[PDB]
Amino acid sequence: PQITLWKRPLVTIKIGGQLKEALLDTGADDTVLEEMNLPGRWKPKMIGGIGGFIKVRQYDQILIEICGHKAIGTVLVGPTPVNVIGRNLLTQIGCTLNF
Amino acid sequence: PQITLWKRPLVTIKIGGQLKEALLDTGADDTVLEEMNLPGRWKPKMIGGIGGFIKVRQYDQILIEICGHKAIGTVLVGPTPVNVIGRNLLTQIGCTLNF
Ligand SMILES: CC(C)CN(C[C@@H](O)[C@H](Cc1ccccc1)NC(=O)O[C@H]1CO[C@H]2OCC[C@H]21)S(=O)(=O)c1ccc2c(c1)OCO2
């Protein structure tokens, strides 16, 4: 699809077999999801945003489907205010910015 | 142009007479610029993301040229680590997400 930006670019995702809503976020290097139970091994990591740094659980090689497009990659889980889909997965679904 | 997302989508902007690098950020509702001394009236605002909130100064009807495309709108200035072009100006330059 071609998505305009007068509204938040929110899309449905599927992760861990569960449906969620997430924001397509070209300003995010990484994909960061609100706290949830997720099957897979994880390691603790720190990530910084506009307000400071938070602790997250890093899950490697996670299956995640984004608006019908399948990806497999790193998903960070922690106290983010919003589920954000970052560039690590936006590249996998072939996403570009155009103007 | 078409901008792939392998790397951060940094473009050159012109604002307040200065050339700067800024992120084309679909996850940002508002445009937020690193500390600079703009003229004119402003009002305080708090914006939140990963890590919490930062206090910023809100300037209205600011002219910004983004990769050769002119825009005018609300610009927030504060201790952000990165210059962020948000959806309020991305729509004005005709920017879409495509996949
Ligand atoms: C978290 C999302 C919902 C909001 N953010 C825009 C993001 O694109 C932000 C933009 C951002 C980029 C770099 C540093 C700080 C902010 N990126 C970010 O936090 O990404 C983190 C996750 O991946 C990592 O790569 C970048 C930081 C890490 S933001 O910068 O906090 C932000 C910008 C404009 C706003 C706002 C919040 O509230 C209203 O107007």
PDB file of C-alpha atoms and ligand atoms in Angstrom:
ATOM      1  CA  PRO A   1       0.000   0.000   0.000  1.00  0.00           C
ATOM      2  CA  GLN A   2       0.816   3.711  -0.198  1.00  0.00           C
ATOM      3  CA  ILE A   3       0.233   5.291   3.216  1.00  0.00           C
ATOM      4  CA  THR A   4      -0.218   9.021   3.676  1.00  0.00           C
ATOM      5  CA  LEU A   5       0.729  10.661   6.936  1.00  0.00           C
ATOM      6  CA  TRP A   6      -2.202  12.859   7.974  1.00  0.00           C
ATOM      7  CA  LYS A   7      -2.935  10.042  10.457  1.00  0.00           C
ATOM      8  CA  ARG A   8      -0.589   7.861  12.501  1.00  0.00           C
ATOM      9  CA  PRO A   9       0.565   4.953  10.274  1.00  0.00           C
ATOM     10  CA  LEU A  10      -0.917   2.280  12.511  1.00  0.00           C
ATOM     11  CA  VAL A  11      -1.144  -1.281  11.217  1.00  0.00           C
ATOM     12  CA  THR A  12      -2.133  -4.668  12.524  1.00  0.00           C
ATOM     13  CA  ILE A  13       0.716  -7.012  13.411  1.00  0.00           C
ATOM     14  CA  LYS A  14       0.805 -10.660  14.488  1.00  0.00           C
ATOM     15  CA  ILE A  15       3.473 -11.730  16.986  1.00  0.00           C
ATOM     16  CA  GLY A  16       3.477 -14.786  19.221  1.00  0.00           C
ATOM     17  CA  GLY A  17       0.283 -15.765  17.432  1.00  0.00           C
ATOM     18  CA  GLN A  18      -1.456 -12.672  18.845  1.00  0.00           C
ATOM     19  CA  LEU A  19      -2.823  -9.680  16.953  1.00  0.00           C
ATOM     20  CA  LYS A  20      -1.707  -6.202  17.990  1.00  0.00           C
ATOM     21  CA  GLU A  21      -1.606  -2.680  16.586  1.00  0.00           C
ATOM     22  CA  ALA A  22       1.774  -1.041  15.942  1.00  0.00           C
ATOM     23  CA  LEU A  23       3.193   2.156  14.510  1.00  0.00           C
ATOM     24  CA  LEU A  24       5.349   2.157  11.351  1.00  0.00           C
ATOM     25  CA  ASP A  25       8.224   4.245  12.663  1.00  0.00           C
ATOM     26  CA  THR A  26      10.975   5.280  10.270  1.00  0.00           C
ATOM     27  CA  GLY A  27      12.711   7.138  13.099  1.00  0.00           C
ATOM     28  CA  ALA A  28      13.201   3.921  15.074  1.00  0.00           C
ATOM     29  CA  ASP A  29      16.265   1.811  14.382  1.00  0.00           C
ATOM     30  CA  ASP A  30      14.707  -1.068  16.325  1.00  0.00           C
ATOM     31  CA  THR A  31      11.300  -2.639  16.852  1.00  0.00           C
ATOM     32  CA  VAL A  32      10.058  -2.101  20.392  1.00  0.00           C
ATOM     33  CA  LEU A  33       6.810  -3.607  21.694  1.00  0.00           C
ATOM     34  CA  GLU A  34       4.940  -3.075  24.952  1.00  0.00           C
ATOM     35  CA  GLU A  35       5.467  -5.683  27.637  1.00  0.00           C
ATOM     36  CA  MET A  36       4.002  -9.029  26.639  1.00  0.00           C
ATOM     37  CA  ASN A  37       4.595 -12.759  27.067  1.00  0.00           C
ATOM     38  CA  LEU A  38       6.573 -13.941  24.039  1.00  0.00           C
ATOM     39  CA  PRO A  39       7.946 -17.426  23.357  1.00  0.00           C
ATOM     40  CA  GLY A  40      11.672 -17.485  22.709  1.00  0.00           C
ATOM     41  CA  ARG A  41      14.965 -16.962  24.481  1.00  0.00           C
ATOM     42  CA  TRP A  42      15.841 -13.360  25.352  1.00  0.00           C
ATOM     43  CA  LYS A  43      18.707 -11.275  26.739  1.00  0.00           C
ATOM     44  CA  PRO A  44      18.453  -7.984  28.620  1.00  0.00           C
ATOM     45  CA  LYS A  45      19.496  -4.830  26.761  1.00  0.00           C
ATOM     46  CA  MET A  46      19.246  -1.042  27.117  1.00  0.00           C
ATOM     47  CA  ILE A  47      17.827   1.293  24.458  1.00  0.00           C
ATOM     48  CA  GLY A  48      17.562   5.086  24.432  1.00  0.00           C
ATOM     49  CA  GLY A  49      14.744   7.226  23.093  1.00  0.00           C
ATOM     50  CA  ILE A  50      13.778  10.877  23.283  1.00  0.00           C
ATOM     51  CA  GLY A  51      13.306  10.800  27.083  1.00  0.00           C
ATOM     52  CA  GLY A  52      16.101   8.556  28.223  1.00  0.00           C
ATOM     53  CA  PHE A  53      17.011   4.882  28.423  1.00  0.00           C
ATOM     54  CA  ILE A  54      14.875   1.862  29.298  1.00  0.00           C
ATOM     55  CA  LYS A  55      15.613  -1.809  29.960  1.00  0.00           C
ATOM     56  CA  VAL A  56      14.182  -4.183  27.355  1.00  0.00           C
ATOM     57  CA  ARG A  57      14.158  -7.907  26.614  1.00  0.00           C
ATOM     58  CA  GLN A  58      15.796  -8.623  23.265  1.00  0.00           C
ATOM     59  CA  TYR A  59      14.240 -11.505  21.330  1.00  0.00           C
ATOM     60  CA  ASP A  60      16.240 -12.630  18.308  1.00  0.00           C
ATOM     61  CA  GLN A  61      14.839 -14.110  15.126  1.00  0.00           C
ATOM     62  CA  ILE A  62      11.147 -13.647  15.972  1.00  0.00           C
ATOM     63  CA  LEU A  63       8.412 -14.269  13.412  1.00  0.00           C
ATOM     64  CA  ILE A  64       6.242 -11.170  13.035  1.00  0.00           C
ATOM     65  CA  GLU A  65       3.728 -10.323  10.332  1.00  0.00           C
ATOM     66  CA  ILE A  66       3.170  -6.654   9.513  1.00  0.00           C
ATOM     67  CA  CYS A  67       0.075  -5.689   7.531  1.00  0.00           C
ATOM     68  CA  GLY A  68       0.174  -9.020   5.723  1.00  0.00           C
ATOM     69  CA  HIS A  69       3.957  -9.059   5.133  1.00  0.00           C
ATOM     70  CA  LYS A  70       6.090 -11.576   6.979  1.00  0.00           C
ATOM     71  CA  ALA A  71       9.336 -10.697   8.717  1.00  0.00           C
ATOM     72  CA  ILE A  72      11.747 -12.503  11.023  1.00  0.00           C
ATOM     73  CA  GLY A  73      14.059 -10.448  13.197  1.00  0.00           C
ATOM     74  CA  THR A  74      14.900  -8.736  16.444  1.00  0.00           C
ATOM     75  CA  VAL A  75      12.053  -7.590  18.657  1.00  0.00           C
ATOM     76  CA  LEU A  76      12.618  -5.574  21.822  1.00  0.00           C
ATOM     77  CA  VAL A  77      10.024  -5.842  24.607  1.00  0.00           C
ATOM     78  CA  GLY A  78       9.796  -3.322  27.402  1.00  0.00           C
ATOM     79  CA  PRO A  79       8.079  -0.211  28.774  1.00  0.00           C
ATOM     80  CA  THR A  80       7.696   1.695  25.528  1.00  0.00           C
ATOM     81  CA  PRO A  81       4.628   3.975  25.339  1.00  0.00           C
ATOM     82  CA  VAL A  82       3.790   2.635  21.858  1.00  0.00           C
ATOM     83  CA  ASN A  83       4.349  -0.535  19.830  1.00  0.00           C
ATOM     84  CA  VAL A  84       6.806   0.675  17.196  1.00  0.00           C
ATOM     85  CA  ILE A  85       7.933  -1.156  14.055  1.00  0.00           C
ATOM     86  CA  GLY A  86      11.483   0.002  13.392  1.00  0.00           C
ATOM     87  CA  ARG A  87      13.732  -0.031  10.354  1.00  0.00           C
ATOM     88  CA  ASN A  88      15.091  -3.512  11.070  1.00  0.00           C
ATOM     89  CA  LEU A  89      11.689  -4.908  10.074  1.00  0.00           C
ATOM     90  CA  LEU A  90      10.527  -2.127   7.731  1.00  0.00           C
ATOM     91  CA  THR A  91      13.359  -3.108   5.386  1.00  0.00           C
ATOM     92  CA  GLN A  92      12.205  -6.721   5.426  1.00  0.00           C
ATOM     93  CA  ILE A  93       8.738  -5.789   4.213  1.00  0.00           C
ATOM     94  CA  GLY A  94      10.200  -3.623   1.480  1.00  0.00           C
ATOM     95  CA  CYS A  95       9.164  -0.277   2.969  1.00  0.00           C
ATOM     96  CA  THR A  96      10.436   2.983   1.470  1.00  0.00           C
ATOM     97  CA  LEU A  97       9.762   6.657   1.988  1.00  0.00           C
ATOM     98  CA  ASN A  98       8.728   8.553  -1.135  1.00  0.00           C
ATOM     99  CA  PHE A  99       8.096  12.231  -1.962  1.00  0.00           C
TER     100      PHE A  99
ATOM    101  CA  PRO B   1      13.121  10.794  -4.310  1.00  0.00           C
ATOM    102  CA  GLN B   2      12.731   7.263  -2.971  1.00  0.00           C
ATOM    103  CA  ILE B   3      14.510   6.635   0.324  1.00  0.00           C
ATOM    104  CA  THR B   4      15.274   3.082   1.450  1.00  0.00           C
ATOM    105  CA  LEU B   5      15.496   2.320   5.167  1.00  0.00           C
ATOM    106  CA  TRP B   6      18.751   0.361   5.441  1.00  0.00           C
ATOM    107  CA  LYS B   7      20.189   3.477   7.089  1.00  0.00           C
ATOM    108  CA  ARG B   8      18.570   6.299   9.044  1.00  0.00           C
ATOM    109  CA  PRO B   9      16.546   8.508   6.638  1.00  0.00           C
ATOM    110  CA  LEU B  10      18.529  11.679   7.222  1.00  0.00           C
ATOM    111  CA  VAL B  11      18.025  14.613   4.837  1.00  0.00           C
ATOM    112  CA  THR B  12      19.269  18.192   4.795  1.00  0.00           C
ATOM    113  CA  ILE B  13      16.821  20.807   6.097  1.00  0.00           C
ATOM    114  CA  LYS B  14      16.995  24.610   6.230  1.00  0.00           C
ATOM    115  CA  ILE B  15      15.420  26.379   9.227  1.00  0.00           C
ATOM    116  CA  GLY B  16      16.094  29.729  10.876  1.00  0.00           C
ATOM    117  CA  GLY B  17      18.861  30.356   8.354  1.00  0.00           C
ATOM    118  CA  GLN B  18      20.710  27.155   9.308  1.00  0.00           C
ATOM    119  CA  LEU B  19      21.361  23.953   7.382  1.00  0.00           C
ATOM    120  CA  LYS B  20      20.943  20.820   9.492  1.00  0.00           C
ATOM    121  CA  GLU B  21      20.467  17.067   9.159  1.00  0.00           C
ATOM    122  CA  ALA B  22      17.127  15.632  10.253  1.00  0.00           C
ATOM    123  CA  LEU B  23      15.273  12.327  10.313  1.00  0.00           C
ATOM    124  CA  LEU B  24      12.192  11.825   8.162  1.00  0.00           C
ATOM    125  CA  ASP B  25      10.191  10.234  10.979  1.00  0.00           C
ATOM    126  CA  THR B  26       6.757   8.672  10.360  1.00  0.00           C
ATOM    127  CA  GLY B  27       6.578   7.796  14.062  1.00  0.00           C
ATOM    128  CA  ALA B  28       6.748  11.430  15.141  1.00  0.00           C
ATOM    129  CA  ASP B  29       3.452  13.349  15.343  1.00  0.00           C
ATOM    130  CA  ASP B  30       5.380  16.635  15.676  1.00  0.00           C
ATOM    131  CA  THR B  31       8.649  18.089  14.450  1.00  0.00           C
ATOM    132  CA  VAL B  32      11.315  18.338  17.146  1.00  0.00           C
ATOM    133  CA  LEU B  33      14.662  20.037  16.620  1.00  0.00           C
ATOM    134  CA  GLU B  34      17.849  20.059  18.664  1.00  0.00           C
ATOM    135  CA  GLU B  35      18.515  23.106  20.828  1.00  0.00           C
ATOM    136  CA  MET B  36      18.675  26.315  18.807  1.00  0.00           C
ATOM    137  CA  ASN B  37      17.931  29.976  19.469  1.00  0.00           C
ATOM    138  CA  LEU B  38      14.932  30.787  17.270  1.00  0.00           C
ATOM    139  CA  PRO B  39      13.328  34.242  17.406  1.00  0.00           C
ATOM    140  CA  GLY B  40       9.718  34.903  18.271  1.00  0.00           C
ATOM    141  CA  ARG B  41       7.118  33.818  20.774  1.00  0.00           C
ATOM    142  CA  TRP B  42       6.806  30.232  21.954  1.00  0.00           C
ATOM    143  CA  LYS B  43       4.891  28.202  24.527  1.00  0.00           C
ATOM    144  CA  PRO B  44       6.129  25.258  26.590  1.00  0.00           C
ATOM    145  CA  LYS B  45       5.168  21.672  25.777  1.00  0.00           C
ATOM    146  CA  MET B  46       6.021  18.173  26.997  1.00  0.00           C
ATOM    147  CA  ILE B  47       6.492  15.305  24.539  1.00  0.00           C
ATOM    148  CA  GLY B  48       6.933  11.679  25.508  1.00  0.00           C
ATOM    149  CA  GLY B  49       8.529   8.677  23.917  1.00  0.00           C
ATOM    150  CA  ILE B  50      10.833   5.857  24.884  1.00  0.00           C
ATOM    151  CA  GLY B  51      12.509   6.772  28.158  1.00  0.00           C
ATOM    152  CA  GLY B  52       9.974   9.403  29.173  1.00  0.00           C
ATOM    153  CA  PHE B  53       9.301  13.095  28.429  1.00  0.00           C
ATOM    154  CA  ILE B  54      11.352  16.132  27.459  1.00  0.00           C
ATOM    155  CA  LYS B  55      10.284  19.753  27.840  1.00  0.00           C
ATOM    156  CA  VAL B  56      10.354  21.706  24.587  1.00  0.00           C
ATOM    157  CA  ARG B  57       9.540  25.147  23.200  1.00  0.00           C
ATOM    158  CA  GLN B  58       6.730  25.280  20.657  1.00  0.00           C
ATOM    159  CA  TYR B  59       7.069  27.774  17.811  1.00  0.00           C
ATOM    160  CA  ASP B  60       4.196  28.251  15.343  1.00  0.00           C
ATOM    161  CA  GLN B  61       4.290  28.947  11.613  1.00  0.00           C
ATOM    162  CA  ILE B  62       8.005  28.275  11.195  1.00  0.00           C
ATOM    163  CA  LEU B  63       9.365  27.957   7.641  1.00  0.00           C
ATOM    164  CA  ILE B  64      11.379  24.796   6.975  1.00  0.00           C
ATOM    165  CA  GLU B  65      12.782  23.600   3.645  1.00  0.00           C
ATOM    166  CA  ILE B  66      13.097  19.796   3.599  1.00  0.00           C
ATOM    167  CA  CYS B  67      15.276  18.299   0.885  1.00  0.00           C
ATOM    168  CA  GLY B  68      14.285  21.120  -1.468  1.00  0.00           C
ATOM    169  CA  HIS B  69      10.572  21.113  -0.553  1.00  0.00           C
ATOM    170  CA  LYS B  70       9.193  24.096   1.375  1.00  0.00           C
ATOM    171  CA  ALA B  71       6.993  23.649   4.426  1.00  0.00           C
ATOM    172  CA  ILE B  72       5.573  25.783   7.204  1.00  0.00           C
ATOM    173  CA  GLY B  73       4.181  24.700  10.539  1.00  0.00           C
ATOM    174  CA  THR B  74       4.699  23.990  14.214  1.00  0.00           C
ATOM    175  CA  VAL B  75       8.283  23.287  15.257  1.00  0.00           C
ATOM    176  CA  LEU B  76       9.335  22.141  18.743  1.00  0.00           C
ATOM    177  CA  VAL B  77      12.819  22.952  20.061  1.00  0.00           C
ATOM    178  CA  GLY B  78      14.463  21.234  22.993  1.00  0.00           C
ATOM    179  CA  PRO B  79      17.162  18.851  24.253  1.00  0.00           C
ATOM    180  CA  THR B  80      16.447  16.103  21.744  1.00  0.00           C
ATOM    181  CA  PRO B  81      19.466  14.073  20.583  1.00  0.00           C
ATOM    182  CA  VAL B  82      18.320  14.190  16.962  1.00  0.00           C
ATOM    183  CA  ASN B  83      16.464  16.530  14.630  1.00  0.00           C
ATOM    184  CA  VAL B  84      13.096  14.889  13.829  1.00  0.00           C
ATOM    185  CA  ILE B  85      10.810  15.850  10.943  1.00  0.00           C
ATOM    186  CA  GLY B  86       7.372  14.687  11.997  1.00  0.00           C
ATOM    187  CA  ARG B  87       4.100  14.060  10.220  1.00  0.00           C
ATOM    188  CA  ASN B  88       2.917  17.664  10.463  1.00  0.00           C
ATOM    189  CA  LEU B  89       5.576  18.592   7.887  1.00  0.00           C
ATOM    190  CA  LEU B  90       5.991  15.259   6.094  1.00  0.00           C
ATOM    191  CA  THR B  91       2.472  15.600   4.726  1.00  0.00           C
ATOM    192  CA  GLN B  92       3.315  19.062   3.379  1.00  0.00           C
ATOM    193  CA  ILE B  93       6.169  17.749   1.237  1.00  0.00           C
ATOM    194  CA  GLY B  94       4.074  14.870  -0.077  1.00  0.00           C
ATOM    195  CA  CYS B  95       5.849  12.057   1.789  1.00  0.00           C
ATOM    196  CA  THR B  96       4.299   8.588   1.838  1.00  0.00           C
ATOM    197  CA  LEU B  97       5.242   5.149   3.142  1.00  0.00           C
ATOM    198  CA  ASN B  98       5.229   2.460   0.452  1.00  0.00           C
ATOM    199  CA  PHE B  99       5.505  -1.332   0.608  1.00  0.00           C
TER     200      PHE B  99
HETATM  201  C1  LIG C   1       8.639   6.368  20.137  1.00  0.00           C
HETATM  202  C2  LIG C   1       7.788   7.040  19.045  1.00  0.00           C
HETATM  203  C3  LIG C   1       6.283   6.696  19.228  1.00  0.00           C
HETATM  204  C4  LIG C   1       7.902   8.567  19.181  1.00  0.00           C
HETATM  205  N1  LIG C   1       9.246   9.120  18.827  1.00  0.00           N
HETATM  206  C5  LIG C   1       9.685   9.140  17.383  1.00  0.00           C
HETATM  207  C6  LIG C   1      10.562   7.890  17.112  1.00  0.00           C
HETATM  208  O1  LIG C   1      10.820   7.768  15.754  1.00  0.00           O
HETATM  209  C7  LIG C   1      11.902   8.118  17.845  1.00  0.00           C
HETATM  210  C8  LIG C   1      12.740   9.199  17.144  1.00  0.00           C
HETATM  211  C9  LIG C   1      14.118   9.217  17.888  1.00  0.00           C
HETATM  212  C10 LIG C   1      15.389   8.712  17.222  1.00  0.00           C
HETATM  213  C11 LIG C   1      16.728   8.683  17.905  1.00  0.00           C
HETATM  214  C12 LIG C   1      16.815   9.229  19.319  1.00  0.00           C
HETATM  215  C13 LIG C   1      15.565   9.777  20.016  1.00  0.00           C
HETATM  216  C14 LIG C   1      14.234   9.803  19.293  1.00  0.00           C
HETATM  217  N2  LIG C   1      12.630   6.879  17.741  1.00  0.00           N
HETATM  218  C15 LIG C   1      12.912   5.969  18.847  1.00  0.00           C
HETATM  219  O2  LIG C   1      12.627   6.199  19.982  1.00  0.00           O
HETATM  220  O3  LIG C   1      13.595   4.823  18.441  1.00  0.00           O
HETATM  221  C16 LIG C   1      14.170   3.966  19.534  1.00  0.00           C
HETATM  222  C17 LIG C   1      13.871   2.731  19.222  1.00  0.00           C
HETATM  223  O4  LIG C   1      14.981   2.409  18.058  1.00  0.00           O
HETATM  224  C18 LIG C   1      16.054   3.088  18.384  1.00  0.00           C
HETATM  225  O5  LIG C   1      16.529   3.941  17.221  1.00  0.00           O
HETATM  226  C19 LIG C   1      16.300   5.227  17.511  1.00  0.00           C
HETATM  227  C20 LIG C   1      16.141   5.314  19.117  1.00  0.00           C
HETATM  228  C21 LIG C   1      15.698   4.081  19.477  1.00  0.00           C
HETATM  229  S1  LIG C   1       9.796  10.401  19.764  1.00  0.00           S
HETATM  230  O6  LIG C   1      11.066  10.861  19.211  1.00  0.00           O
HETATM  231  O7  LIG C   1       9.738  10.001  21.160  1.00  0.00           O
HETATM  232  C22 LIG C   1       8.607  11.680  19.449  1.00  0.00           C
HETATM  233  C23 LIG C   1       8.798  12.609  18.273  1.00  0.00           C
HETATM  234  C24 LIG C   1       7.721  13.624  18.018  1.00  0.00           C
HETATM  235  C25 LIG C   1       6.521  13.740  18.944  1.00  0.00           C
HETATM  236  C26 LIG C   1       6.352  12.852  20.106  1.00  0.00           C
HETATM  237  C27 LIG C   1       7.430  11.777  20.380  1.00  0.00           C
HETATM  238  O8  LIG C   1       5.270  13.144  20.712  1.00  0.00           O
HETATM  239  C28 LIG C   1       4.516  14.126  19.836  1.00  0.00           C
HETATM  240  O9  LIG C   1       5.398  14.607  18.941  1.00  0.00           O
END
